[PDB]
Symmetry: D2
């Protein structure tokens, strides 16, 4: 398939490069993160990707406790991104990096990126760290409501990307560093953060919000029925502040991408749960090979009509292209 | 479908009853947990369930930090269960409750239950608490290897059931108590515990072990490909003790049940990932209605041959009920 | 689900009533007759009880396609269409109509379609397979040259054509000899309709008139499950197909066809279709009065698909297709 | 996957070679002929390169079923079976055989089946649909009374019967008039075979001989997708069906049939079949030489199913069905 849109495609600036085993692989990953116009573009040309919506790596800004420095790095990463996109505006779009450890500063930067730089959304790596940085700050908290109000006003999607939990909140993984990151920790951290947003009632207040999750929803589709329907015989209204069910917000305010989850069975389950209209192609480059993602997607077992939607038209619609 | 086997069916004793919002619902749940020969049996007769493998509620024994006490409560719960099964051996089988905060004591109690009481397996509610009870004790730790060797020797399945994480390990849920329990916390806690067992190399050392997970695998099937294949371009070997991939152990040493997850889409995904031969019917009664579980399973969109396997023969084979 | 649209919903006029007699046991004939003649009473109450807002009505089968005499065929078609228009007018907020066509006379059929669409406001046509004409011993398929002008008009008017089943003629039914239970909805209906559809595709009809919209009931008469094989059998042979059409069967099926759930309330079948043609091209339908409305609705309300797709298949796909 | 078993793999003898001429363009005819006559060379090299350990061979189509003279049919069937036995003997660790049968003569077919199984060690029979006999203008279906003794012997021998396709006779093909491209594997093969299978079911054959094992290629010739409708159409009519069989079509399909992946390398189709008949009754097959072995193997090795089912469908279901363990 040609003319695809990919939207979980990362890059890094020297300041965040360290955020992502010594050897040829680490050297190659560093090159990939810093490259935009060469290797990356050539692969897009060879693997039917017309549009790549770029985003800074992780955890990046979300792991900078000093709001002062966080604001600076975010602004820097965004200006570099804007400069890179301007080189091939017909191929590159951008997601803004935000210093959410400072609500007002984050709101201001999002406005600058969207209104002045033409960015089409924001991508944030989970909870923020601030001050001593020993407390995970989730976005369902009261201090972030004004920010969400602005996101809805600008009417641009918010990509909730993964990050690892803090050491003090990772005891279940002690002795098993191999379970951290994309293996599992990433999904749990992001899925729960997403559920917190839903349970908080954020989407009752701002129903036009569009949240995007990668890695096919971080496991949510498979367990969505249970999330709401567990212990169904108990006919008492849910305790959380949200007015409706988790499935309602997931089906109405979320979209998921195929980033780093090139599995047909998983895609079929998602198609039968959230629907093909809310699934988007993405790769997670440079952490995943573009050819791996594209070759899988080009042949996965779905209707050609849905391959066109998931690979291109869903995204073009969502981002008003 | 008639002749079904269900194996995540709970009961409680006064001592553990509390582990399980005042009103008519709480009163009903208590009655259900304490009943075995009446209401429960009537529902089994009305909803085609021939065999019910019973197990104590949660967290129960796993939440008793004092070794001696945990050993006492487990032994008591097992003796009670043994007596209840003896009244209708043609309908009730039993899973052992184990005081794993004391490895040696747990091994002996399992032997006692299997060899002297005829129990067909063990059901444990995740990690154990011991001493000050501030440290979650996972079963991939070295001190539990002798235990697993015995489980394999006795050749009976181990049902790894959920429990909530300790408060100090649940900050991600702070302010959202509704996310604890069956809504989500139960699955995360159990899925990871399962992965720890796998990564530890436990199944290389004891390949004949049979582990059972409820709630359709606690989310594992959907993300299994990613667990091993994420960042595939990096051809460097994983550094965990296990010699093979997570999918190998999941596919060869695990079985999942339909407890509290009556969703056809989820079942189809599981069938295309682990296969119908490793999926078992279960309800999670009394936390789930038996009619809800049975009505869903009787009509879910699978081959009739697989409805028979998942509903009955897979379990008959696993627990050696045909000889 | 409420507000559903159903489009394989039949009725009969006295002149075609008997065509449905040999499709149900004699003990159920009285009831089936009542159902076929009733449009404003029981039918509407069932629609209200089972969340059906719009019902696109069509004459029963084989009806007009089984009338060998052209003059007579044209007569019955016009009468059936006039009656349908009269019934729809009594409850225009709930009923729409498909035209019955005397295709044993191409020119007459083209004229009748124009009248139904332009003057009566019909939203499409429903035809029960091949036509019989003259001695009526030869099945007339619509991929034949004489029907090209007709198809050009269908595309111009831009209304869908529902290719409904009918049984093959006796001389073309030997494979079912001794097995009358295989005729009709059990199997014969599907084979007859699936092949007719393939004939249209292979003929190049859609190369000439790419904007045509054809609708098939019973989840595509079996086509989705075998579509890959239809084009890809003997793939090692790198040579172009031998038929007139310029592209593959899957291209025309994916671009010019839509399928309905009429008389095929099977979740597995729906999942396969979703993974082959996509939810955007599947429409809810019941096949009432030959199928119970509650059977169709209860199954569809709970089938294992995304709620977003339940809304599309149950309502919005049809509202988009018929420009409602 | 290595160690696969494939069971819709054809060959031909000079006497039946021309039967396959009309199913491939003139340019590919030379190649198809080579493939059909080859068993020990090219075929084996492809099996070694594409993980196929066992290939159960069968004569091409329509072959014997299109020979109306009983005597000639018996002669050709016997000759084809002797050649096949000779070929299998050259490499018995890789090749097994399905018997060709002269069913235009029930008694002769029964005797030849006995000879193939008891003396030649054949593991079943493969028949290309209905038989023609005498004037050859009437399709002879196996649900007819004269074939009951034969079926009884098939059950006694306890070997599977592969009901393979063939095209209908011209007078029974008017729906395809002007569309020769719809005959054969494109569609006609499936319709012809699906209905023949339904006739067997409806006849009550499986009530009388419940241990029979019938095999269909091309993923069931379309049956799985429409099976619900076959039994449940017009469900509101609460009256038993009119056919002689005591149960439902789905019952016989689920209990007496197995389907193969021959010439139908489509994941969506396989998923539907898994959710209808179950993985325990689906078998890998290629339809070589009409289909490329690598096409079948490459697709099957990567299709979206559980690895446990890939092993069953690719090898163990067949080994269990043909008692190879
Ligand atoms: O965004 C993906 C990603 C980020 C950091 C590390 C890693 O392994 C990843 O796959
Ligand atoms: O075992 C299931 C279970 C246990 C404790 C509480 C609960 O809600 C449950 O569903
Ligand atoms: O249109 C459907 C239909 C028509 C005639 C007969 C029958 O059984 C049917 O299901
Ligand atoms: O068996 C398959 C087959 C036989 C004859 C002809 C053909 O095209 C085929 O695909
Ligand atoms: Zn990423
Ligand atoms: Zn439980
Ligand atoms: Zn109809
Ligand atoms: Zn063949």
């Amino acid at each position: 398939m040609q003319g695809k849109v990919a939207l979980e495609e990362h890059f890094a600036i020297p300041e965040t490069l360290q955020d992502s085993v010594p050897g040829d692989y680490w050297k190659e990953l560093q090159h990939r993160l810093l490259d935009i116009q060469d290797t990356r573009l050539k692969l897009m040309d060879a693997h039917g990707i017309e549009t790549m919506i770029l985003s800074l790596n992780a955890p990046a800004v979300q792991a900078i406790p000093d709001r002062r420095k966080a604001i600076e790095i975010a602004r820097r990463a965004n200006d570099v991104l804007a400069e890179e996109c301007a080189k091939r505006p017909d191929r590159f779009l951008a997601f803004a990096a935000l210093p959410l450890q400072d609500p007002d500063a984050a709101t201001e930067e999002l406005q600058r990126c969207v209104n002045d730089l033409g960015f089409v959304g924001a991508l944030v790596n989970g909870f923020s760290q601030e001050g001593d940085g020993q407390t995970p700050l989730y976005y369902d908290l009261p201090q972030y409501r004004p920010f969400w109000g602005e996101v809805e006003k600008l009417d641009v999607p918010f990509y909730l990307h993964p990050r690892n939990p803090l050491p003090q909140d990772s005891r279940i993984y002690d002795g098993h560093p191999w379970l951290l990151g994309p293996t599992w920790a990433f999904a749990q951290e992001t899925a729960v953060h997403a559920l917190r947003l839903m349970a908080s009632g954020l989407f009752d207040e701002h129903p036009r919000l569009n949240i995007i999750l990668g890695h096919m929803g971080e496991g949510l589709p498979y367990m969505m029925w249970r999330i709401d329907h567990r212990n169904a015989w108990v006919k008492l209204p849910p305790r959380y502040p949200a007015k409706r069910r988790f499935m309602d917000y997931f089906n109405e305010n979320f979209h998921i991408t195929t980033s780093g989850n090139f599995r047909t069975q998983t895609l079929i389950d998602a198609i039968l749960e959230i629907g093909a209209d809310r699934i988007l192609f993405s790769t997670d480059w440079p952490f995943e090979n573009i050819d791996h993602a594209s070759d899988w997607f080009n042949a996965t077992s779905i209707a050609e009509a849905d391959r066109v939607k998931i690979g291109r038209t869903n995204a073009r619609r969502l981002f008003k292209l």
